[PDB]
């Protein structure tokens, strides 16, 4: 009775402490010791094994002292002996993989657990019978106790985390990894680097997000363990995005000593299901059979009707279906896609009638889906000569000077805006002109006719981006979204076209074409949905993803009706528009002058001609086929409404022959002219903020009604308005709301 059989730790449940270390030849083993040291309720080490490492005279001091330097040389947390024991000496635990057994087992203290060992382990396995029948150590079931983790002194620290290589710039212990530790698509950069400017869909390796905190409050005090698991999961997903990430797949990559490993394994499942629901992993164009739904059966019971089969509806439909939720999509047109619609009949090339460009591929779901599909994008070159009528290529210094001046007018507007309210908003177009004449009259500087036309060109570039003449767009709010982190990296041409992704998202889903929804009634126990021919559908929840213009036209009857607040938000945004023309030629007539540039600009002769074929795109990055695509923006959209396709073509060809005046231009052998503005179920290209409006409108439209009626679409995404990406993400957003 010289020594103790009781644990130092007050409240500890261990009635019979035994020493896991047996490092000292004088180890107390399971008998009496001066003091029992507590790592967990199930794990202790005696005073002499403590001293074996902690005392300068003992034979373990060497090792401990070295570890302590490293722990300090690429680590930040305190290197006590308890920390050393949890990181270096604590025996590993591994779960038997026999389906009928599944018992946890302690490995002998010299065996170093690896993924391979964890993957295939079953009771009794040693490098050099009836092992599964032996009872499971009692301390294992203990780990499930609510207080077990509170009785655990130091948080776990993962070893050889898949996330480690992507996290070199951090101290491993701040991201749940062990300091004592020693080709991914370039577009996958899920982790912020230390002190780096904001970018879209990026997370801090060392801080829990709002939603994470909300779902896992028990970690607000200490996130170490959560962060490590979440980081490991993200790294695994992006390491192989072509298959579903499962707990079985994650478990072998969780390497840490002691019973706590059991806690980590049991936690990785909850975290993984949270990441899946929010759409962080197991997403994109990944598809899974009935046998393999991504969420447990408890999310499964409920039904959804999704209205619209564009990127937004299809994203949500894909997500929900993958979750195991019963989904039905109703599409008005005779095709899926919405504002994604590819013409695949041009020999050797795919020409988008709608979207075909990706602005910022880093962390972009579109770039992820390309990886999953094994398709390539073409990054745009920089050069874009501004060609005049007829023939002269504008001096680049004139291009850069007027660009500089145009952005200048924008800066001053961003100053004038700082003290105005929505009630005081003025059209961007008006305020620009005004600032221009002001500046002109101040410093008498005058611009050449060509300078004024090049400015006309740059102005047209903003009208294109807004989908409207600037006299309808808000000076206060035109660029509201820039407030949020935007997608970094390459701007590309989706050569194969967005349709490839649309089709994958749609494959195997219950989709009803030519079924235009007319009535939505959510006043009863289930949502009653009625099409224009009187066909009835019903489900517990309904997701609306129709274009902004269709909400403004009130094409769908809501009962109860949308709120006045919602109607104001809906009416405060503009239904922006542009159209495209695509021309096929017998040969690449522009090669001599264009010299391999992806696109070239067309200087407007006069303000009146602004936006009329402002830019031409060479639609084959391989420089082999001959297809040009051009855009009609701003006022020019109007002037084309009353013309038939043949007439639009005439003016394009005439424009081209002016642009290439000093040479012959062959006749086109195939073309299309888009009519988005008069497509009855679309009537637009993309949204923008009208004068008097706020970026807040996007949130307000996005707001669900009574957790019964939900909304998605490009016009509901405040961070990323307008884009296929933003539309897709809004659909993922709603799928997460709905699945909860």
């Amino acid at each position: 009775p010289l020594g103790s059989r009781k644990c130092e730790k007050a409240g500890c449940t261990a009635t019979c402490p035994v020493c896991f270390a047996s490092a000292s030849e004088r180890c107390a083993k399971n008998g009496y010791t001066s003091r029992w040291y507590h790592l967990s309720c199930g794990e202790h080490f005696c005073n002499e094994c403590f001293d074996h490492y902690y005392r300068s005279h003992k034979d373990g001091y060497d090792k401990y002292t070295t570890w302590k330097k490293i722990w300090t040389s690429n680590g930040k947390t305190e290197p006590s002996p308890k920390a050393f024991m949890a990181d270096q000496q604590l025996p590993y635990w591994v779960q038997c993989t026999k389906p009928e057994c599944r018992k946890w087992r302690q490995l002998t203290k010299e065996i170093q657990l690896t993924p391979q060992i964890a993957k295939t382990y079953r009771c009794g396995m040693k490098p050099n019978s009836d092992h599964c029948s032996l009872p499971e150590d009692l301390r294992v079931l203990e780990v499930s106790n609510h207080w077990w983790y509170s009785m655990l002194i130091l948080p776990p620290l993962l070893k050889d985390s898949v996330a480690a290589p992507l996290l070199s710039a951090y101290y491993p212990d701040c991201v749940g990894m062990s300091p004592s530790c020693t080709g991914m698509n370039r577009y996958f950069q899920p982790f912020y680097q230390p002190n780096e400017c904001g970018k879209a869909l990026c997370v801090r390796p060392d801080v829990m997000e709002l939603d994470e905190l909300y779902e896992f409050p028990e970690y607000s005090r200490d996130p170490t363990m959560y962060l490590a698991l979440r980081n490991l999961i993200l790294a695994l997903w992006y390491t192989n995005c072509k298959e579903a990430l499962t707990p079985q797949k994650c478990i072998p990559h969780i390497i840490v000593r002691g019973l706590v490993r059991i806690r980590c394994v049991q936690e990785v499942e909850r975290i993984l299901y949270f990441m899946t629901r929010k759409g962080l992993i197991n997403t994109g164009v990944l598809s899974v059979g009935a046998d393999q739904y991504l969420l447990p059966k408890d999310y499964h019971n409920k039904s959804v009707i999704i209205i619209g089969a564009g990127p937004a509806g299809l994203a949500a439909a894909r997500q929900l279906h993958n979750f195991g939720i019963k989904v039905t999509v109703l599409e008005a047109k005779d095709r899926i896609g919405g504002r994604v619609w590819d013409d695949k009949s041009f020999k050797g090339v795919t020409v988008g009638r709608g979207a075909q460009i990706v602005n910022g591929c880093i962390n972009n779901p579109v770039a992820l889906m390309c990886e999953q599909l094994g398709i390539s994008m073409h990054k745009f070159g920089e050069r874009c000569d501004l060609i005049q009528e007829g023939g002269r290529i504008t001096d680049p210094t004139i291009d850069k000077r007027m660009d500089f001046h145009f952005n200048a007018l924008l800066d001053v507007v961003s100053e004038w805006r700082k003290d105005k309210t929505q009630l005081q908003d003025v059209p961007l177009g008006e305020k620009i002109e005004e600032i221009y004449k002001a500046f002109i009259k101040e410093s008498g500087i005058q611009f050449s006719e060509l300078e004024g036309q090049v400015l006309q060109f740059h102005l047209s570039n903003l009208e294109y981006a807004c989908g409207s003449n600037l006299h309808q767009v808000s000076a206060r709010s035109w660029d509201h979204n820039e407030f949020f982190a935007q997608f970094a990296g390459d701007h590309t041409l989706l050569t194969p076209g967005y349709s490839v992704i649309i089709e994958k998202l749609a494959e195997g889903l219950d989709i009803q074409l030519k079924s235009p929804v007319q009535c939505i009634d959510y006043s009863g126990d289930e949502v009653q949905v009625t099409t224009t021919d009187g066909t009835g559908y019903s489900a517990q929840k309904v997701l609306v993803t129709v274009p902004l213009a269709l909400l403004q036209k009130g094409a769908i009857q809501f009962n109860p009706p949308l709120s006045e607040k919602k109607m104001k938000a809906i009416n405060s945004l503009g239904a922006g528009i542009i159209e495209k023309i695509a021309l096929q030629f017998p040969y690449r007539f522009w090669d001599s002058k264009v010299q391999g540039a992806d696109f070239f600009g067309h200087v407007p002769p006069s303000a009146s001609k602004r936006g009329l074929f402002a830019v031409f795109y060479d639609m084959d990055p391989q420089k082999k086929h001959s297809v040009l695509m051009s855009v009609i923006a701003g006022e020019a959209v109007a002037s084309v409404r009353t013309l038939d396709d043949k007439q639009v073509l005439q003016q394009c060809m005439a424009t081209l022959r002016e642009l290439f005046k000093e040479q012959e231009v062959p006749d086109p052998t195939k073309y299309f002219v888009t009519r988005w503005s008069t497509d009855p179920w679309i009537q637009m290209a993309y949204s923008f903020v009208k004068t008097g409006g706020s970026g807040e409108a996007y949130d307000i439209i996005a707001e669900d009604i009574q957790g019964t009626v939900f909304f998605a679409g490009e016009a509901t995404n405040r961070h990323f308005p307008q884009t296929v990406t933003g539309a897709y993400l809004s659909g993922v957003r709603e799928a997460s709301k709905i699945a909860a």
């Binding site: 904001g198 869909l201 407030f483 982190a485 993922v732």
Partner: peptide
């Protein structure tokens, strides 16, 4: 600062 915050983990 929501000039950093992940769009998908900021919905509450």
């Amino acid at each position: 600062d929501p000039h950093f915050h992940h769009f998908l983990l900021s919905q509450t």
